[PDB]
């Protein structure tokens, strides 16, 4: 997160870190046994880390649970990033509490102008590299489909939306991938892609979660 703020420990209780020896992507807890992330975050050997603030210190609210199964969206295209979504099932159920909590899935899509909270442990510089230890947060609005398409000609599908600031300076970044975009208490987006970070006229691009709720619910019901 570039241009954001320190969230505060466990104030984003559905935020997870995906760990394969090191943090490499975010995710969102959607029930006691399932996590939603970005397909481009797929790898084997995932440990899900719940309850994290400082990802380099054991502070007392963590739950570390191995993935038992990963399911990349059937139609994921790694070249275009269309359908950049994946589900991860935990080997055991998380113990849900005030600091480790699921986020509601949307019943309807969000609209341009709605404010949302984006979070993660990704890079905090746009012309630099600095990775935070504690969770960072950014409040940002959804942008219109037309301004999204104008920012990224020929690249925005119906499964993508833009959010952030055309002026630059405030965005998600490398290492935030897979993490949440939550709007009015609903998971509406997944950190997916963008040209650099926090660059003028190059807002973040997010997977549009509302398009996937049918797939998510049926997948959970059969696995
Ligand atoms: Ca920790």
Curated annotation (Swiss-Prot):
Binding, Ca(2+): 52, 54, 57, 62
Keyword Oxidoreductase: no
Tissue: Synthesized in the acinar cells of the pancreas.
UniProt-recorded Gene Ontology molecular function terms: endopeptidase activity; metal ion binding; serine-type endopeptidase activity; serpin family protein binding
GO biological process terms, semicolon-separated: digestion; proteolysis
Free-text remark on how the cofactor is bound: Binds 1 Ca(2+) ion per subunit.
Cofactor(s) needed by this chain: Ca(2+)
Keyword tags: Calcium, Digestion, Disulfide bond, Hydrolase, Metal-binding, Protease, Secreted, Serine protease, Signal, Zymogen
Record-annotated active site: 40 (charge relay system), 84 (charge relay system), 177 (charge relay system)
EC number: 3.4.21.4
Chief location of this protein within or outside the cell: secreted
PANTHER family assigned to the protein according to its UniProt record, in alphabetical order: RIKEN CDNA 2210010C04 GENE, TRYPSIN-RELATED
Protein name: Serine protease 1
Originating species: Bos taurus (Bovine)
Gene from which this protein is expressed: PRSS1
